[PDB]
Amino acid sequence: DFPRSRLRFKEKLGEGQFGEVHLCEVDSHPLLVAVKILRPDATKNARNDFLKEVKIMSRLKDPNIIRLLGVCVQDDPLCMITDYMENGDLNQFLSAHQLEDKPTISYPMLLHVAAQIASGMRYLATLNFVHRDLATRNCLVGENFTIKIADFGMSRNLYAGDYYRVQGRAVLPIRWMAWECILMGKFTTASDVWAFGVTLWEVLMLCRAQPFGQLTDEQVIENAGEFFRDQGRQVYLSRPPACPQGLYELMLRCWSRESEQRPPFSQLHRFLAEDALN
């Protein structure tokens, strides 16, 4: 519950802020798991953060959310054990595919991927859990095209350009952030909805471009001010070439100026699983 000696470390999968993820083998033939441990330079602050993440993760029980399989909080060394997701994060996965003409992925499959994210988010909503960093870099692919939402410390490292860093401030995914988050730092379910729109845009781009990729960080922050001013000078992500107009309009609703006018995840799921099929 759970004995450490049964873990055979295989390869480093990546490195976060207080943690590090390795592929491991379990001997009771061989089961593969992903194991998050403290980094070698871990401090007391890191240990505390690790213990809090166990607490948060122990609550989360849904098919489309990362699952905690097992733990060491018992005796050190600390670890979290989760499912090994053979196909990596969603960003890597989609980047390695092209859209089917007429390794490939179909448009109905992109919808299925996005519907699974929406369902994960619907679960989190019911718990009044705000994610704060929804993006494809934070989703895992298991196949048979199983998507699980996670929150990786390591995302901040391998996707450094996706985060706006000022000394003494929190590290902010500004390109995925609702205008009111950029201007006020008020993170809500409604700002998760906005980030879901951006995430959906990424899925439809097959992760080929950063959101507002031709614009600087400052222009992105200035753009949020334009939402606030509401003088019809705000700018939006363009329609992906794979995206039909009806699906684009769903994205646009995620990006409503008013929080309350953004669709709940129940509705987003329904649209992506049913309405989008026509």
Ligand SMILES: O=C(NCc1cccnc1)Nc1ccccc1Cl
């Ligand atoms: O995904 C999360 N942690 C990365 C991890 C953990 C264990 C093994 N491998 C990776 N956490 C997480 C997920 C959803 C909401 C909040 C958090 Cl903090």
